Amino acid sequence: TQSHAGQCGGIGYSGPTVCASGTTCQVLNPYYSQCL
Ligand SMILES: *[C@H]1O[C@H](CO)[C@@H](O)[C@H](O)[C@@H]1O
Prior knowledge:
Layout: E1 25-27, E2 33-35
The structure holds alpha-D-mannopyranose (MAN).
């Protein structure tokens, strides 16, 4: 479960793209997305 400030789901990330409750996967860069 991706936590706040962690990379939730950008290109290159094949891991679990689900953020912890309270946060949303905010894609900033195409490869860097962060749970906010
Ligand atoms: C999940 O992890 C983030 C850091 O990656 C923390 O800021 C958050 O409070 C939670 O422990």
